[PDB]
C-alpha cells in the first residue's frame, strides 16, 4: 500500500521505508497476470519484465490495474524487443521484422528511425515503458551465433549511426531505450547464457567496442545494460555487471573518451544466465550488482523476492551497503520513471 506522490525525484527517498527503497531497485520477470499482481501488491517492486515465458494476455486489461495500484511512482514495464530473433511482442506489434544486421544492410538510417518509432508507439499503447534495445555490440560473427545478426555491424561508425537511429526512434515514441551489453559483447569468448565470457583487452575495447558509447550515452533519456563480461585490464575474473571498476568507468567516461554518465544502469539477467548462476545464488548476485553501482537489478522470476529483500536489509544493517548508495539509485529510477499523472 504505497501511495502516489508529487515530490521531486531528489526527494523521493524521504517518502520511503528502507525496505521499499530497496524494492524500487528490483525488476522481475513474471508468469502471468496473477504472478505480476501478487509481486507488486506484496513486495512493491520497482518494475516487471515481460519475459520469454510471460503470458501475453496480461495486456488485455490486467496490466492497467496492476500499474494503477503501485506507488509512489508509475510501475516500470520492460521487455526484450530488438526485432528478428529477439522479438517477444512479435504477435502484437506486427511481427519480428528484420534482424538488426539485416536492417543496416537493406534500409537507410532514417528508415530505421521510422521503424523503431512505429514499433515503439505500439509498445507504449500496450503499457511498455522500457525496451532492452538497441544492441550496440560490434561483430562480424555468423548470423545464428549469440550476438550474430543482433548486431548492426562490424564497424563502430556503422553501429553508432544505426543503433543511434533505433534509440532515437524509441525515444520519439516515449519508450526508454537501453544500450547493451557494456563494455562490449561482440567479440566475447562465448555465450553468457551458459558460461563465463571474456572480452579482448581494455585497450582494444577503448578503440573499437566502446566507441559507439562515446556519443550515444549523451542522448537522454537512455539507459545502459552491463553484461556478464570479464574484461582483461578492468575487472579480472569478475563479470562487469558485478564489478564496481566497470560501472565506475561508465560513470566517469574519461578513460574511454566519453563524457560522464548519470542515467540508469541495469544488470543483465542475474538468475537465468549461467555466467552468474554458476557462481552466485540470486540474493548474493543482487547484492553484488548494487554494490557495483547498478541502479536496477534484473532477473526473470518472482519467487526469490522475499529472500532477496531480506538479504539486502541485512547488508544495510551490517554496513555491506551504505544508504547513500541506495538513495542515489532511487533518485535515478524516479527520474527515469518521470512524474505521476495528476501532478
Numbering used by the authors: 46 to 388
Could you share sentences copied from the article?
To test this, we cloned, expressed and purified LpqITB using an N-terminal His6-SUMO tag, which was subsequently cleaved from the protein. LpqI consists of a single TIM-barrel domain similar to cytoplasmic Gram-negative orthologs but lacks the C-terminal domain associated with extracellular NagZ enzymes from some Gram-positive bacteria. Superposition of the post-cleavage NagZPa complex with LpqI indicates that the appropriate coordinating residues for MurNAc or 1,6-anhydroMurNAc recognition are intact in LpqI, supporting its role in PG-recycling. The only detectable activity for LpqI was with GlcNAc-containing substrates. The Michaelis–Menten constants (kcat = 2.0 × 10–2 ± 0.04 × 10–2 s−1 and Km = 72 ± 5 µm) of LpqI using 4MU-GlcNAc as a substrate were found to be similar to other NagZ enzymes using this substrate. In a similar assay we were also able to show that LpqI releases GlcNAc from soluble PG fragments, including PG fragments with a 1,6-anhdroMurNAc terminus. In this assay, LpqI was not observed to release any soluble PG in contrast to the muramidase mutanolysin. Together these data support the role of LpqI as an exo-acting enzyme involved in fragment recycling, rather than as an endo-acting autolysin. From these experiments, we concluded that LpqI is involved in amino sugar recovery but is not required for stem-peptide recycling. In contrast to inhibition of P. aeruginosa NagZ, deletion of lpqI resulted in an increase in survival in the presence of lysozyme and all cell wall active antibiotics tested.
